[PDB]
Amino acid sequence: QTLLDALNVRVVGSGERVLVLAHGFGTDQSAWNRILPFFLRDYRVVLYDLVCAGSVNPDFFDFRRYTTLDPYVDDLLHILDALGIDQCAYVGHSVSAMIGILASIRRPELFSKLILIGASPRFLNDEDYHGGFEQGEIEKVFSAMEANYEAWVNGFAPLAVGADVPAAVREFSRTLFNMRPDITLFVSRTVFNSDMRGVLGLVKVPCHIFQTARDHSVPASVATYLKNHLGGKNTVHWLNIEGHLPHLSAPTLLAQELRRALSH
Numbered sequence: 001q002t003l004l005d006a007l008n009v010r011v012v013g014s015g016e017r018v019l020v021l022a023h024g025f026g027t028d029q030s031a032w033n034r035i036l037p038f039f040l041r042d043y044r045v046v047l048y049d050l051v052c053a054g055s056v057n058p059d060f061f062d063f064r065r066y067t068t069l070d071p072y073v074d075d076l077l078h079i080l081d082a083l084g085i086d087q088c089a090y091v092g093h094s095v096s097a098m099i100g101i102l103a104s105i106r107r108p109e110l111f112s113k114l115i116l117i118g119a120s121p122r123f124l125n126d127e128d129y130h131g132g133f134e135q136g137e138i139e140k141v142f143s144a145m146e147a148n149y150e151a152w153v154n155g156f157a158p159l160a161v162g163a164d165v166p167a168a169v170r171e172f173s174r175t176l177f178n179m180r181p182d183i184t185l186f187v188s189r190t191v192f193n194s195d196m197r198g199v200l201g202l203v204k205v206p207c208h209i210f211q212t213a214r215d216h217s218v219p220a221s222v223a224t225y226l227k228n229h230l231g232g233k234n235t236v237h238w239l240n241i242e243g244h245l246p247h248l249s250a251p252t253l254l255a256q257e258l259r260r261a262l263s264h
């Protein structure tokens, strides 16, 4: 219960099929609020907050521990194990997509399916590989994030949301601004330093790759990369949704696509 309490674990819904909804960067579990009504009636929905979420006591964010994705996988597995979940479908936005991938390699039996939203195994460019970002441009962003966090949020949130959906821009900004600035920077460094390309072939559960248009964080070719390199049966859903946070900006359409992927 103490981790379950610390990370605001919530189990809701009247169904028996277990569905884990795992928020990503800059949000908390409330990013799923508008998706939830579409699943509460026929799934048992598990939600939690990543340790870096603005909604979690920043005392739990231990900079000596959370230096890679692996301790975040530990937290997810502990939660699922504590709850007695021996199989689930798992939806991971942003960094939670990579967390779910790693968890699935550790525990191949735990996941029936992974649904990946706004996922990338690597943000940085490399030889054969377009991640979308150059090392140099990214140091400039880290400097701005350190120099003026509130301003960085206000410039970043419209790019992340992408589509002109002011309510979703304000909502993402709200949860980014709830994160302690040095946590946000450290998490961002952690993930820009991450490269999951080498482990994708180890995954054996089926993955549904949800890819929006003009995703600031994820070039189209990255979705194709995941499809070609994840080791199990993969399916790309090319969503008629613009931007990196489709659960915030287009929830109805996102929820219908999720239901389709789950029923596949």
Ligand SMILES: Cc1c(Nc2ccccc2C(=O)O)cccc1[N+](=O)[O-]
Pocket (backbone or CB within 6 Å): 024, 025, 094, 095, 118, 138, 141, 187, 188, 191, 192, 216, 217
């Ligand atoms: C894209 C980005 C992010 N994004 C992340 C960082 C960590 C985990 C997930 C993300 C994510 O976008 O899903 C953070 C800071 C700066 C920038 N940027 O555009 O320079």
